[PDB]
Design a protein around this motif. Structure first.
Motif, mmCIF file in Angstrom:
data_model
loop_
_atom_site.group_PDB
_atom_site.id
_atom_site.type_symbol
_atom_site.label_atom_id
_atom_site.label_comp_id
_atom_site.label_asym_id
_atom_site.label_seq_id
_atom_site.Cartn_x
_atom_site.Cartn_y
_atom_site.Cartn_z
ATOM 1 N N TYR B 378 1.004 -1.143 0.011
ATOM 2 C CA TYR B 378 0.073 -0.068 -0.140
ATOM 3 C C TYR B 378 0.891 1.214 0.174
ATOM 4 C CZ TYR B 378 -2.995 3.575 1.518
ATOM 5 O OH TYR B 378 -3.920 4.851 1.765
ATOM 6 N N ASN B 379 1.720 1.492 0.831
ATOM 7 C CA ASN B 379 2.555 2.588 1.158
ATOM 8 C C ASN B 379 3.517 2.414 -0.145
ATOM 9 O OD1 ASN B 379 1.244 2.026 3.472
ATOM 10 N ND2 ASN B 379 3.270 2.926 4.747
ATOM 11 N N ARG B 382 1.609 3.998 -2.952
ATOM 12 C CA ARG B 382 1.326 5.519 -2.558
ATOM 13 C C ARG B 382 2.412 6.397 -2.713
ATOM 14 N NH1 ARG B 382 -1.314 9.620 -1.865
ATOM 15 N NH2 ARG B 382 -2.951 9.728 -0.511
ATOM 16 N N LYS B 383 3.779 5.749 -2.412
ATOM 17 C CA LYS B 383 5.029 6.486 -2.628
ATOM 18 C C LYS B 383 5.073 6.763 -4.243
ATOM 19 C CE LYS B 383 6.536 7.008 0.756
ATOM 20 N NZ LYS B 383 5.884 8.030 1.851
ATOM 21 N N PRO B 385 2.841 6.229 -7.390
ATOM 22 C CA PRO B 385 1.612 6.092 -8.208
ATOM 23 C C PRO B 385 1.919 5.975 -9.575
ATOM 24 C CG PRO B 385 1.705 8.282 -7.391
ATOM 25 C CD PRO B 385 2.788 7.714 -6.794
ATOM 26 N N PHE B 463 -7.165 4.803 -3.022
ATOM 27 C CA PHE B 463 -6.206 5.095 -2.174
ATOM 28 C C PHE B 463 -6.436 6.617 -1.557
ATOM 29 C CE2 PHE B 463 -2.571 2.221 -3.860
ATOM 30 C CZ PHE B 463 -3.384 0.999 -3.420
ATOM 31 N N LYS B 465 -5.629 7.823 1.641
ATOM 32 C CA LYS B 465 -4.600 8.337 2.667
ATOM 33 C C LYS B 465 -3.094 7.768 2.192
ATOM 34 C CE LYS B 465 -4.975 4.867 6.095
ATOM 35 N NZ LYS B 465 -5.120 3.731 4.994
ATOM 36 N N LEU B 466 -2.331 8.146 3.099
ATOM 37 C CA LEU B 466 -0.944 7.736 2.941
ATOM 38 C C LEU B 466 -0.256 7.052 4.000
ATOM 39 C CD1 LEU B 466 1.541 10.699 1.902
ATOM 40 C CD2 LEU B 466 -0.795 11.022 3.075
ATOM 41 N N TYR B 468 -0.123 4.750 7.127
ATOM 42 C CA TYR B 468 -0.811 3.281 7.356
ATOM 43 C C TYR B 468 -0.184 2.672 8.548
ATOM 44 C CZ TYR B 468 -3.455 -0.852 5.550
ATOM 45 O OH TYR B 468 -4.585 -1.617 5.464
ATOM 46 N N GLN C 311 -8.636 -0.099 -9.489
ATOM 47 C CA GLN C 311 -8.843 1.437 -9.284
ATOM 48 C C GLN C 311 -9.953 2.091 -10.453
ATOM 49 O OE1 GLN C 311 -7.756 2.527 -6.292
ATOM 50 N NE2 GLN C 311 -6.899 4.592 -6.479
#
Lengths: 83, 487, 317, 68, 51, 102
Positions: B378-379, B382-383, B385, B463, B465-466, B468, C311
């Motif tokens: 997930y992170n 997120r870092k 995309p 996604f 939020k960032l 976690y 997504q």
């Protein structure tokens, strides 16, 4: 070719969720209970640069602000400046 | 019995001659201990313990009290004989005698205090005895730990973890005793004894706390922390050059990562040891897991001093395996993986290779490792995309408001599609993992556990939020999940 | 009925083949709350105890009284669920303490039959449960944390795989641990190597050589676990090929119920695919591996195998 | 073993003079032998050249550097 | 006599004869990425992290 | 047209009207556009090179200077007049990210 560095978003502080993307004096103002000059004096006693954003200010300086603002008489803040 | 009778006689007491006779009895107590090696007075040794307490009280009285040449020689010789009896009892105790062991150690400690206030040689003889001691349950505890001794582990947990002056003279006499060529081989045999003596986290270079003082007068044990670290580094380099095994190897790697580096001086020799430990790759299924803590040491060294390791992320691609999921160090290895992949110069090919490898891993990985690997994926997306295209391609999704030409083109594209990802390619830049989607994350959506399934729904939802909290969702186990589900 | 040992002594002083009828009479008398709750307690613990002790009697004198006991359990479970769930939780606690004291040396075929009667009895299709999901992750940890080095552990895993095959034919979920179990058992069967070092098996002594006829009169599943797992230390090639075809049949059953609906069955089955292609290139006469490769080839030709639409959500108003 | 091989080769691939000083400070002959056992030939050649220029710059330094 | 340097949400212009912080550009939101002058020595362009 | 620097190039500088420098990875390759080919290449750097600049026709014994910093504090000065030969070097402790010359 990696590189490492030393950022936080909307972040919690004294059960108040203030942003890291504003000026730190006004972040401590929007911490409920204290205002402009109180936050200014708290930053001056915590010895931080008043131009950084709150996305800066690592956690040791943060908890320094916390302990100074929650032990205010013990950091030479006068009673007439106190509530 | 006879020991108690001699005790009472010496207590009531030619008093020097009587004390000498009692000392002769307490030295024949060594022969009694030799007989106790067969059977500790019908497996009890209560008489032996009483005689030891008697000898201790007698040594105390002798130190408090005592032709002056002859008299002093007799007194010192009696004290030394009692000490030597205690040392030999601690040394030749192959039999697991707790009470006799404690008696010998306490008598040695009391005599050491009396000598430090009245008489280093006694200390080195003591350590020679404790290191010539050996037991079957002590030698190379393979499941966990270093050496499940009795006498050296109790000596450490109530004698070594208290006195920093003894810690300094301890390491300096270990330097002397390793320059001693035979006791160097004694240490080389008892490599695990120092290991169980050193894992107790409360040494002198740990300035987080203070240690009390044993002797009423310390002979300058505060002379230099770098001298302390020189003793540390010399002892540690000698033991890492001599007689290594697998469990002791993992233990010294753990103590090296966490506890040694505040106490050390020569990280270049540590770097050479660590790069040999990280390049250690063999067909041994038990020794193939050392590169985890080896890379831990190598990276904290690279942070402390700018050193290198060529094809770093290629080696990380090589080291990510399901054996990491099966070993119990993947929590700290994923801490390491986070501070690896937090670099702002990695690319789409790298993050795609690592996310597809972790996707096959979460296809076949245990649920504790699944709840470790969800926050990292997930992170990571997120870092970066820049790889949302593999979670959904914009070209493969459909829409009613487009022409039948593009309809037929989409159909023929879906026919001529082929998954181009390569697993055996070791170059993470060369693995074409940008086109391969995550049907394995779709299976993680089709998991069996409710909490894991909800984390997969968090993957499926957009996604938002960032933050976690990888450390919060980092350490979980089957038993912990049982406790949480019952609570 | 007041105590476990007491009522067990009563049933044993009676007769274990008629203890079912005796306990049924006692229960009928008690029914004609707390009494029947303690009866449920002793009856659970007593049938688990019987499954631990003895299975010398045949299907016509032991399976019939065991199924009669199971029917009595069906009645007391249709009447009672709170006390049954409570002692089920205490059974979780005691078998977990048994495991953490002895990883392997404190388990039971009684715990296996406890899991199977829970799976037959409860609403297994539930997503969350006070009994099933704790027992589900216990069965997972049981099939995963055991150091697989012997055929009795292999058969333990086989019957656990059968029970979770029932679980996911009525619930239709997925287990990465049953994938790992299949790969581990196949690698420890064909260790006898160069293509699989990531599976991390435990034992280098058992294998599968080329002296099997694999006929139909050759031994099928025929699981007499209370006897087969106790005599499997005597190791012929026929017991090995029977447990091999047993785990293979449960594998194919799990495929045909849930893994066809699993979206990544391709990448789930690739290590099993290379293992079975090694099987066919090593033996060249295995018809059930041939049918399995044909079914999975049909599944590769049938599946979408297209990048997803994960997504993709609707715009907010 | 306790060698310094990769640090020697790293200094010789990038001739850092401070790193060369800190890696020539040692004097343990077994480590010297094991290094120049597990070093590259041409890298050892340029190491000999660096040894020569360091001895010529500081002839007082040549003491432990005489066996290298 | 001057040069610009990128830093944490900030662009700082230093002089040469004094070596001191002459100008501070802090109108940004997140950390800047590039700072480049023009050939006429008047405009600097600052690439930021918001596109 | 393109010219292949296999490792990720992180800097490109037209050092002369005819030559360019690809500063990326461990080494750096100095190409010429007219011959469409690498004239030279230097791999004397420890880590990944992080910055490179050039200065020309100024008050110095060396007419043209090429600085390259490589994530160690290690900045190094070459000169294209000597076929990009090593001339000087400074070392700062922290891994340097950017260097610049007046």
């Amino acid at each position: 070719s990696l590189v490492v560095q030393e950022f936080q978003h909307i972040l919690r502080l004294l059960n108040t969720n203030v942003d890291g993307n504003i000026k730190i004096v006004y972040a401590l103002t929007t911490i409920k209970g204290v205002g402009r000059r109180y936050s200014n004096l708290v930053c001056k006693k915590a010895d931080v640069d008043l131009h950084k954003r709150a996305g800066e200010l690592t956690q040791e300086e943060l908890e320094r602000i916390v302990q100074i603002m929650q032990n205010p008489t013990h950091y030479k803040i006068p009673a007439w400046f106190l509530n | 019995m006879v020991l108690l009778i001699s005790e009472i006689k010496d207590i009531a007491k030619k008093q020097y001659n009587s004390i000498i006779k009692l000392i002769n009895e307490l030295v024949i107590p060594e022969n009694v201990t030799q007989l106790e090696e067969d059977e500790t007075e019908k497996n009890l040794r209560f008489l032996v313990m009483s005689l030891f307490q008697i000898f201790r009280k007698l040594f105390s009285r002798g130190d408090l009290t005592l032709l002056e040449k002859e008299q002093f020689v007799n007194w010192c010789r009696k004290v030394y004989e009692a000490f030597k009896t205690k040392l030999l009892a601690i040394i030749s105790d192959i039999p697991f005698e707790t009470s006799l062991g404690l008696d010998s150690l306490d008598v040695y400690l009391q005599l050491a205090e009396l000598e430090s206030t009245h008489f280093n040689k006694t200390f080195r003889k003591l350590i020679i005895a404790l290191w010539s001691s050996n037991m079957g349950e002590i030698e190379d505890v393979k499941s966990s730990g270093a050496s499940e001794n009795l006498i050296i582990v109790e000596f450490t947990e109530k004698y070594y973890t208290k006195f920093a002056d003894i810690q300094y003279y301890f390491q300096s006499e270990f330097n002397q005793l390793l320059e001693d060529p035979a006791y160097q081989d004694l240490l080389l045999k008892n490599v695990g004894k120092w290991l169980a003596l050193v894992n107790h986290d409360k040494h002198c270079s740990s300035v987080d706390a203070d240690l009390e003082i044993f002797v009423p007068n310390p002979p300058q044990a505060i002379e230099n922390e770098s001298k302390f670290k020189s003793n540390f580094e010399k002892n540690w380099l000698s033991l890492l050059n001599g007689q290594l095994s697998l469990q002791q190897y993992k233990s010294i790697l753990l103590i090296l990562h966490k506890r040694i580096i505040p106490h050390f001086h020569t990280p270049t020799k540590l770097m050479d040891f660590l790069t040999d430990s990280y390049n250690l790759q063999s067909s041994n299924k038990n020794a193939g897991v050392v590169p985890i803590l080896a890379l831990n040491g190598l990276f904290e060294l690279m942070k402390r001093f700018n050193l290198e390791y060529p094809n770093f992320y290629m080696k990380l691609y090589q080291i990510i395996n399901p054996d990491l999921m099966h070993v119990k160090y993947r929590a700290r290895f994923f801490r390491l993986m986070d501070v690896f992949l937090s670099s702002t110069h990695l690319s789409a090919h790298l993050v795609a290779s690592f996310i597809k490898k972790l996707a096959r891993l979460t296809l076949e990985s245990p649920p504790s490792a699944i709840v470790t690997v969800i926050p990292f994926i997930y992170n990571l997306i997120r870092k970066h995309p820049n790889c949302m295209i593999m979670l959904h391609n914009p070209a493969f999704i459909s829409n009613p408001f487009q022409t039948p030409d593009q309809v037929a083109n989409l159909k023929t594209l879906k026919e001529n599609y082929v998954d181009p990802f390569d697993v055996h390619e070791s170059d993470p830049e060369l693995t074409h993992a940008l086109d391969s989607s995550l049907w394995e994350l779709a299976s993680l959506m089709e998991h069996y556990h409710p909490n894991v399934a909800t984390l997969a729904k968090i993957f499926a939802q957009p996604f938002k939020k960032l933050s976690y909290n990888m450390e919060d969702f980092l350490d979980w186990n089957y038993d912990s999940l049982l406790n949480a589900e019952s609570s | 009925r007041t105590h476990d040992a007491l009522l067990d002594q009563v049933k044993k002083l009676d007769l274990d083949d008629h203890p079912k009828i005796v306990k049924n009479i006692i229960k009928a008398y008690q029914p004609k709350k707390e009494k029947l709750g303690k009866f449920t307690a002793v009856l659970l613990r007593h049938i688990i105890f019987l499954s631990n002790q003895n299975y010398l009697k045949n299907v016509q004198s032991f399976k019939r009284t065991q199924n009669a006991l199971i029917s009595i359990l069906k009645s007391l479970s249709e009447k009672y669920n709170r006390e049954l769930s409570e002692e089920c939780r205490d059974y979780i606690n005691e078998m977990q303490a048994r495991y953490k004291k002895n990883h392997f040396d404190a388990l039971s075929n009684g715990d296996l039959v406890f899991f199977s009667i829970i799976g037959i009895l409860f609403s297994t299709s539930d997503q969350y449960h006070l009994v099933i999901t704790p027992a589900l992750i216990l069965m997972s940890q049981f099939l995963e944390q055991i150091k697989f080095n012997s055929l009795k552990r292999i058969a333990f895993g086989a019957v656990l795989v059968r029970i979770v095959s029932q679980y996911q034919r009525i619930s239709k979920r997925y287990i990465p641990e049953v994938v790992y179990f299949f790969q581990k058992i196949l690698l420890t069967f064909i260790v006898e190597p160069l293509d699989f070092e990531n599976i991390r098996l435990d034992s280098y002594e058992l294998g599968l050589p080329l002296d099997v006829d694999f006929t139909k009169k050759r031994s099928t599943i025929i699981p007499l676990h209370t006897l087969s797992t106790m005599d499997t230390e005597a190791h012929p090639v026929d017991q090995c090929v029977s447990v091999l075809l047993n785990v293979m049949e449960s594998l194919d059953a799990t495929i045909s119920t849930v893994w066809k609906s699993l979206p990544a069955f391709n990448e789930i089955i690739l290590p099993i695919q290379q293992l079975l292609s090694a099987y066919t290139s090593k033996y060249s006469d295995f018809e059930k591996p041939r049918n399995i490769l044909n079914k999975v080839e049909k599944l590769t030709k049938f599946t979408e195998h297209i990048p997803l639409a994960l997504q993709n959500h609707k715009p907010v108003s | 073993t306790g060698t310094v091989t990769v640090i020697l080769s790293q200094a010789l691939q990038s001739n850092d003079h401070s790193l060369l000083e800190t890696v020539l400070n040692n004097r343990d002959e077994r480590v010297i032998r094991d290094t120049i056992f597990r070093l590259k030939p041409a890298l050892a050649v340029i190491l000999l050249e660096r040894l020569a220029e360091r001895i010529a710059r500081q002839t007082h330094r040549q003491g432990p550097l005489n066996v290298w | 006599h001057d040069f610009a340097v990128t830093s944490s949400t900030r662009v700082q212009i230093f002089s040469s004869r004094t070596r001191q912080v002459i100008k501070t550009f802090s109108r940004f939101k997140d950390v800047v990425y590039s700072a480049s002058f023009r050939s006429d020595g008047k405009l600097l362009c600052a690439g930021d992290a918001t596109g | 047209y393109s010219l292949n620097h296999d490792q990720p190039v992180e800097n490109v500088i037209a050092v002369s009207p005819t030559q360019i420098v690809s500063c990326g990875g461990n080494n750096f390759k100095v190409w010429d556009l007219t011959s469409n080919k690498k004239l030279y290449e230097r791999g004397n750097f420890n880590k990944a090179v992080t910055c490179l600049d050039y200065v020309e026709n100024f008050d110095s014994p060396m007419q043209s200077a090429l600085i390259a910093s490589s994530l160690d504090g290690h900045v190094k000065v070459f000169d294209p007049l000597d076929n990009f030969q090593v001339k000087f070097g400074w070392k700062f402790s922290g891994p340097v990210l950017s260097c610049a010359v007046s």
